[PDB]
């Protein structure tokens, strides 16, 4: 498939509808996904792993923070995933706490120092 | 399509003389 047809499958997955029904939200999804296609930060899985561990430690779930360390190695063990940074960066962002400041902590490199 | 084929019925067989990729 292509990403343009594949975005419409996502709009039919989240909103339970057919592609002939939902077309105003897909119109918005093309606006935000298009013109923001290229990756803006330098890719490294190490910083994202050390942030998912920090997040799982912060919720007093210290047992899952080192189970993630055994789950992240199997991704490298199998080896059919090309961009492991992007999917982890996405899965960290959609994370909810079952139950502040970030300019102080470690952030990704801006890619602006290089002549892109 | 491939993730749709990925929902298949798996064979849970194994031997000692077959360690790597032995379905």
């Amino acid at each position: 498939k292509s990403p343009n047809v594949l975005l419409q499958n996502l709009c039919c997955r989240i909103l339970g509808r057919s592609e002939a029904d939902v077309a105003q939200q897909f119109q918005y999804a093309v606006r935000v996904i298009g013109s923001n296609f290229a990756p803006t930060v330098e890719r490294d899985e190490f910083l994202v792993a050390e942030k998912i561990k920090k997040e799982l430690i912060r919720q007093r779930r210290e047992a899952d923070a080192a189970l993630f360390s055994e789950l992240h190695r199997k991704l490298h063990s199998q080896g059919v995933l090309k961009n492991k940074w992007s999917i982890l960066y996405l899965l960290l962002s959609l994370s909810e706490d079952p139950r502040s400041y970030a300019t102080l902590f470690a952030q990704a490199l801006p890619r602006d120092a290089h002549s892109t | 399509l491939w993730e749709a084929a990925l929902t298949y019925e798996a064979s849970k067989r194994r031997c000692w003389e077959r360690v790597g990729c032995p379905p």
Binding site: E42, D44, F46, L47, T103, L104, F105, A106, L109, A113 | -
Partner: protein, 358 residues
């Protein structure tokens, strides 16, 4: 480096002869101080650095070591810690542009070594309850400083890093470690323990108010250092207890039961038993400092006979800037201790009938 052991012995003796009821106050063993391990500081091509384009790549990896505590092949850390401004020795025969350039980068290396020593020194038992927490809040800021340099080293593996690129990258770390080194030396130089190290952080929060980058670091360190001191206030304002194993609180309790017992000769209590300590007020609680002492003063004279303290407030007290919550929580338990002790005195052992009989 050794006069700190003298300092630790003096503060040891002070807490020891002060708090005479409990078991001996905790200490570290001596080797924790005597290790050079815990303090962060402790074939190489003799071509006289001929090749001009390779000099940048050689010195920048020596820089990637020197940013985080390690002497380089060409840069070298001088054997001070006599002073605290730890200077470095670059190789003489360098490109002067490069030698000057790493001279501009080395202040973040010097402002790192004076931070790790502060956290290593003020994590000892003699420095109270709050100067422990001030050296506690700086280490999450040490973590990011290391993470940048490891990411730059792994980028340097690909050859896509320059000395100018590195000098561009480290600009936030040059500021943040400098504010931590300023706070470290300001707590060390003027001896600041307990409430005195809670005043100085509140002063630097007013120094940086319009930057909003150095303010947020400093305001984070204030709320983190205010956690033990305000928790003693969370007992002393609501109950008569000051648990205070290191005498850092604004209120100390004298054992002047020794002179005045079974007859209160001084009628001891208001005058000589409960005193306020002036240097251990954190300079933002001066406004009700008399009321803080009198609040717990009103509770314990009930606690002498009435075992119950029945404070229904039990309000969590914490430092906040811009917004004054810790004034009225003091006023609430001050109103309650005053109301209980008064109405106790007027209903129970009534004062109108005794004055009538006088």
């Amino acid at each position: 480096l050794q006069q700190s052991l003298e300092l630790k012995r003096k503060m040891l003796r002070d807490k020891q002869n002060k708090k005479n009821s409990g078991q001996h106050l905790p200490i570290f063993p001596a080797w924790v101080y005597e290790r050079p391990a815990l303090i962060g500081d402790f074939t190489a091509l003799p071509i006289g650095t001929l090749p001009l384009a390779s000099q940048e790549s050689a010195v920048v990896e020596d820089l990637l070591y020197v940013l985080v505590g390690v002497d380089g092949r060409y840069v070298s850390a001088q054997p001070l810690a006599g002073r605290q401004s730890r200077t470095f020795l670059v190789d003489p025969n360098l490109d002067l542009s490069i030698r000057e350039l790493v001279h501009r980068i080395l202040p973040v290396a010097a402002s790192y070594s004076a931070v790790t020593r502060f956290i290593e020194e003020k994590s000892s038992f003699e420095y109270g309850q709050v100067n422990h927490a001030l050296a506690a809040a700086m280490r999450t800021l040490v973590k990011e400083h290391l993470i940048l340099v490891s990411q730059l080293e792994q980028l340097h593996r690909q050859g896509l890093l320059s000395l100018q690129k590195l000098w561009f990258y480290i600009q936030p770390a040059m500021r943040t470690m400098d504010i931590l080194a300023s706070l470290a030396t300001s707590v060390d130089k003027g001896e600041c323990l307990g409430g005195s190290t809670l005043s100085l952080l509140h002063d630097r929060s007013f120094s940086y108010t319009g930057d909003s980058q150095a303010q947020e670091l400093c305001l984070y360190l204030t709320k983190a250092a205010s956690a033990p001191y305000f928790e003693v206030l969370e007992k002393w304002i609501y109950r008569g207890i000051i648990h205070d194993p290191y005498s850092e609180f604004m209120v100390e309790e004298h054992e002047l039961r020794k002179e005045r017992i079974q007859e209160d000769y001084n009628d001891k209590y208001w005058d000589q038993r409960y005193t306020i300590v002036q240097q251990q007020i954190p300079s933002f609680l001066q406004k009700m400092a008399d009321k803080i002492l009198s609040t717990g003063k009103y509770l314990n004279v009930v606690r002498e006979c009435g075992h119950d303290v029945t404070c229904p407030v039990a309000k969590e007290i914490i430092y906040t800037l811009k917004e004054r919550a810790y004034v009225e929580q003091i006023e609430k338990a001050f109103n309650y201790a005053s109301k209980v002790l008064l109405d106790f005195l007027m209903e129970e052992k009534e004062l109108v009938a005794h004055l009538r009989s006088i």
